[PDB]
Amino acid sequence: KVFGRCELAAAFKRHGLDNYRGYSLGNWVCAAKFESNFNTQATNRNTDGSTDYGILQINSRWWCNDGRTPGSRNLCNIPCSALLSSDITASVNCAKKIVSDGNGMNAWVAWRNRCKGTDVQAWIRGCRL
């Protein structure tokens, strides 16, 4: 499923992401935009053999199990395919654990390079929230 900007903002809010760990909603929407272009089905393989899954591009080396990443830890206790669902609940639950891991949203390279220090509020402007 490819989410609409305001649609995804509303889902993220309903799931308790707005200001979770100090990160306002615009940060999460901006991260989704550049990580997956709002597509729940996005996958991207990395040079180390791991693969990123879903709307927030969660990595198979630490967070989920895809059965093909030697030494994966699966900290979110879920098969990576669950992160590709139109229902973003699993992606949100896992992201909450990632952002709480110590590095905050810096865990997402696209956030760090394209969202961090920008006017992230622009991402929810015009939405009925």
From Swiss-Prot:
Active site: E35, D52
Provenance organism: Gallus gallus (Chicken)
Annotated disulfide bonds: C6-C127, C30-C115, C64-C80, C76-C94
Annotated TM spans: none
Binding site for substrate: D101
Keywords carried by this UniProt record: Allergen, Antimicrobial, Bacteriolytic enzyme, Disulfide bond, Glycosidase, Hydrolase, Secreted, Signal
Protein name: Lysozyme C
Ranges in coiled-coil conformation: none
GO BP annotations listed: cell wall macromolecule catabolic process; defense response to bacterium; defense response to Gram-negative bacterium; defense response to Gram-positive bacterium; killing of cells of another organism
